[PDB]
Amino acid sequence: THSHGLFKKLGIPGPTPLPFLGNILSYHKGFCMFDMECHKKYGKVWGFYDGQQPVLAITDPDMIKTVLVKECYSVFTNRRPFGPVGFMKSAISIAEDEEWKRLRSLLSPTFTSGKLKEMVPIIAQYGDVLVRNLRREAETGKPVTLKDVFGAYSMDVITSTSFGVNIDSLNNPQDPFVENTKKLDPFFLSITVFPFLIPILEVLNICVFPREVTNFLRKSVKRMKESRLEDDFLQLMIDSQNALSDLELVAQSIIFIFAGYETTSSVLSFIMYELATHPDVQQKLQEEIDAVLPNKAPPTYDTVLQMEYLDMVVNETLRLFPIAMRLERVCKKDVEINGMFIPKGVVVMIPSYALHRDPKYWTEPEKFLPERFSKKNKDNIDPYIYTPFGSGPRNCIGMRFALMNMKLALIRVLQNFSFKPCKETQIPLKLSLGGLLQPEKPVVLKVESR
Numbered sequence: 001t002h003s004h005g006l007f008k009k010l011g012i013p014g015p016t017p018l019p020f021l022g023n024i025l026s027y028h029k030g031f032c033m034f035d036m037e038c039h040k041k042y043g044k045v046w047g048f049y050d051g052q053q054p055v056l057a058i059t060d061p062d063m064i065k066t067v068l069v070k071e072c073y074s075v076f077t078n079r080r081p082f083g084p085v086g087f088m089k090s091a092i093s094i095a096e097d098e099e100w101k102r103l104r105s106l107l108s109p110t111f112t113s114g115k116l117k118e119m120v121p122i123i124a125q126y127g128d129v130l131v132r133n134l135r136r137e138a139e140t141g142k143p144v145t146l147k148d149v150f151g152a153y154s155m156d157v158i159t160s161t162s163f164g165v166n167i168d169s170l171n172n173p174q175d176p177f178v179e180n181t182k183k184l185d186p187f188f189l190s191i192t193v194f195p196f197l198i199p200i201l202e203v204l205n206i207c208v209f210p211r212e213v214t215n216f217l218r219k220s221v222k223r224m225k226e227s228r229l230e231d232d233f234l235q236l237m238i239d240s241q242n243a244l245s246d247l248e249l250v251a252q253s254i255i256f257i258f259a260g261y262e263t264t265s266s267v268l269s270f271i272m273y274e275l276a277t278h279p280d281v282q283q284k285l286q287e288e289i290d291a292v293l294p295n296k297a298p299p300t301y302d303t304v305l306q307m308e309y310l311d312m313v314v315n316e317t318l319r320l321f322p323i324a325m326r327l328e329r330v331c332k333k334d335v336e337i338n339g340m341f342i343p344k345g346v347v348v349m350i351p352s353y354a355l356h357r358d359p360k361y362w363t364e365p366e367k368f369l370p371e372r373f374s375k376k377n378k379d380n381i382d383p384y385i386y387t388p389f390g391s392g393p394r395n396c397i398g399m400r401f402a403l404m405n406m407k408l409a410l411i412r413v414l415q416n417f418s419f420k421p422c423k424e425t426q427i428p429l430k431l432s433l434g435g436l437l438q439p440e441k442p443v444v445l446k447v448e449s450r
């Protein structure tokens, strides 16, 4: 509590904290409404308390670039330590300082022109299977849960690539793999307040995903490595096992497996929601696709980057729904950035969801307006207000892979389907309150052959 004076003594505005809890009860809205409202109410910069942890929100495009780009290596290197993680301490996105840079540059040779282009023929094989699955159940003519169908696609595409293991989640509605992956939670509430508990859970072996999902992979990612040793990602980590170790290999894998599944299916669900409620945009895209890939022609690496309107659509959706509600860097030593002292131990927070919807930088910002991304308007958009993939050395390592993957899936779907809203379809869309940005009710849409 003694810490609740920090932003008072520093002269920084904010909702005043309750003992122990901090500003926690404000998240009853949801982490996105809280932030939005705080922006409006306190202007450019403010402080709040995650239980006992001070978090300084910043909005200045300059000050943002300083902490994300210019001052990353020296002072803003790490994210918040977030729960009981155990061996997942070694995962890239969870690692800190030295073990990070090592892991980061050991893995960033993975998503590069070369690699990407090499993943295309494999990923585009599961585009074809997405078309099939959609068609079998458009016959039904009954609302389709996009997330399901997108999920199974997402699934097949990461495994098959980063490893080289086609797992066929698609001829298989029934699946030994996805079960383990995806698994009003008072658990993160009790830690996010009381972090003095955290080392206790570590000793007890209690981890944020059971000795069921990991004990699965422990041996399973062990499984995918072994058969290989006879006659990419899984590859490049074996370059380093001659210095990437046993569980270090497995922990990168889970981080990838998750990101590549969960994020990729949510955005693609959100986009199709958009296209369906904006049939004009859906048409314009379906033309561009048809103009670029004529005769139902299969999408390729170079044809994807040719597609300007598609990129506009992806971007505009990501403006409205940035699956990561905020970016964060823990300040590791005292600092004076753009005339603002920030004490050691503060968590600096960039509120991506809110800035993406700010009057100041977006005219009619609730409206889905892909045209705000055309070559004409493109350059009037600050790269520190628009941050769906974060920025600087700790940005999203999977960006390029994510975009192309989504687009490949978008292309084939549109080059053979139309999507309209029906009864169950939630209009307008309502985001769920929790950690990740999700639609509270699933995206269900009617699908028709072309």
Ligand code: HEM
Pocket (backbone or CB within 6 Å): 068, 092, 093, 094, 104, 255, 256, 257, 259, 260, 263, 264, 267, 322, 323, 324, 327, 328, 387, 388, 389, 390, 391, 392, 393, 394, 395, 396, 397, 398, 399, 401, 402, 403
């Ligand atoms: C559209 C889907 C995706 C969105 C919106 C997205 C967004 C992000 C954002 C905003 C960050 C944090 C940037 C920062 O903190 O400065 C991030 C970090 C990261 N993402 Fe992505 N991401 C997506 C897909 C992926 C994919 C496909 C992978 C890899 C397969 C991936 C792996 C990572 C990793 C490892 C980090 C931590 C990087 C580090 O600390 O070095 N995410 N993601």
Ligand SMILES: CC(C)c1nc(CN(C)C(=O)N[C@@H](C(=O)N[C@@H](C)CC[C@H](C)NC(=O)OCc2cncs2)C(C)C)cs1
Pocket (backbone or CB within 6 Å): 182, 183, 185, 208, 209, 258, 259, 263, 323, 324, 396, 435, 436
């Ligand atoms: C307790 C039992 C019933 C279960 N709860 C769940 C909840 N669930 C679906 C889930 O996997 N969430 C878990 C979880 O780890 N959630 C938090 C901490 C995620 C952290 C944040 C949101 N990061 C994050 O994932 O950002 C997305 C990315 C962008 N680029 C690469 S990844 C937790 C609640 C088990 C599944 S099974």
Ligand SMILES: CC(C)c1nc(CN(C)C(=O)N[C@@H](C(=O)N[C@@H](C)CC[C@H](C)NC(=O)OCc2cncs2)C(C)C)cs1
Pocket (backbone or CB within 6 Å): 079, 093, 094, 182, 183, 184, 185, 186, 187, 188, 189, 255, 258, 262, 324, 433, 434, 435, 436, 437
């Ligand atoms: C706590 C209460 C309010 C609840 N929230 C939820 C939902 N929730 C926590 C959630 O959105 N979880 C989602 C989720 O993020 N999944 C988990 C598995 C991600 C865990 C991974 C290992 N997190 C992780 O470490 O990502 C690294 C990054 C952090 N920031 C940018 S990248 C899940 C539905 C896919 C259910 S109950």
